[PDB]
């Protein structure tokens, strides 16, 4: 526990992707139980919750063509929740709306970098492969406790030190996205239409929590739920994209064990401006769990905070 | 202080199995953490080291390998795997075993050996 000189707003802005992007403030919300056809992203495999922000970067020519049609029409695409990542099988998912767009031609190759926020949950009804091979999905929109928030906010304060939303639906989603749980429980919470049942199940899930180890060798305990802290306005778990185009969901913790640091600190493509990253890997499997962040100025109170990739962790 | 031939003008051209090697290069180019060394030709004047090219007669880098793979300079896959292996081998000569660069190259050489065992 320490003071924060960092600005929680700067990480959310995603300055690393760029700064001079076009902003759309129009909002589109379809009516409940209505059926809609939405094109899906071909490379994304994450499970997006409403209100979460997704930074994106696309290189392939078929993908820039879909984004250009989307900006002309309603700016809405579908991100599915797959039970098996290798398989394309899905049952549920959430819509995403583009609020930020930027085109760039780097060395003659067209580049799009977009930022989107999830809006409405849905149920997959059918998914056909388009002639260009970019599957479009027919889906159906799904319709959607003060004492309960108290108990959750109380326990959450015990884990780490008005940042949390006040509305019921908004608070349930915040907890679901930032909880250190398995993706199987994420799908289960998404399937829960009402907010009351979702909040009660989140309370039960958080009371019984296990430490995290590496996925490859499963022999080294990395961190616990008590080391979690929120360096961003979105919370402890936020999504950031690397320069090649792969999006990472990074958990920010204050202390971690059983990890060796390889290399020297550098600031290139830093998801948190003002800090330098050093690659960390497991002392047994050497699986490159996350990056350790070291500050560049002595004025920042959090001089060192760990950053772990959710994809390389499995609860014990 | 001289760039290796990236593309020829008189050689023949064949297109078989070099597509699979482009998928291998894509896995190493983008792993990507330690790829920024061996990315571009080693630069002696910026590094201060005035003994690298005297120790290593042949310069091989991932980008040179990429450019030759596009102009279809290689007619046989062996020449590619030999060139990739030469890049790693050269690092192990100039650098001692405790150096980080020697540790970085080992991970890439492990990935390269794993993916080059699925040849079609
Ligand atoms: C070959 C050879 N053989 N011997 C030698 N070399 C060398 C050759 C060249 C250079 C060199 C130096 N400078 N530059 C100058 C060349 C510099 C090229 C640019 C390097 C930085 N960019 C690549 C890595 C980053 C990146 C890439 C992929 C994914 C992710 C990220 C970040 N990233 C995350 C990280 C976490 C985060 O917060 N954000 C992210 O986006 C990612 O997800 C992106 C930025 C090149 C040095 C050497 C060295 C050497 C090398 C390293 C160290 Cl430590 C010490 C010595 N040693 C020798 C002389 C003996
Ligand atoms: Zn391990």
Numbering used by the authors:
A (entry chain A): 44 to 187, 250 to 266, 271 to 425
B (entry chain B): 337 to 366, 369 to 458
Question: What does the report in the manuscript say about this coordinate set?
Answer:
We present the design of CRBNmidi, a construct that readily expresses from E. coli with high yields as soluble, stable protein without DDB1.
We next solved the ternary crystal structure of CRBNmidi in complex with PROTAC CFT-1297 and BRD4BD2 to a resolution of 2.9 Å. We chose compound CFT-1297 as a BET PROTAC degrader for crystallographic studies because it is reported to exhibit positive cooperativity of ternary complex formation, and was previously characterized by hydrogen-deuterium exchange mass spectrometry (HDX-MS), providing some low-resolution structural information. The bromodomain docks sideways on top of the CRBN TBD, an orientation imposed by the long rigid alkyl linker of the PROTAC. The remainder of the ZA loop (residues 379–400) and the whole BC-loop are solvent-exposed within the ternary complex structure, as well as the Lon domain of CRBN which is also fully solvent-exposed. Furthermore, by capturing two orientations of BRD4BD2 this crystal structure provides structural insight into complex flexibility that could be challenging to visualize by other techniques, such as cryoEM, in which flexibility can limit resolution.
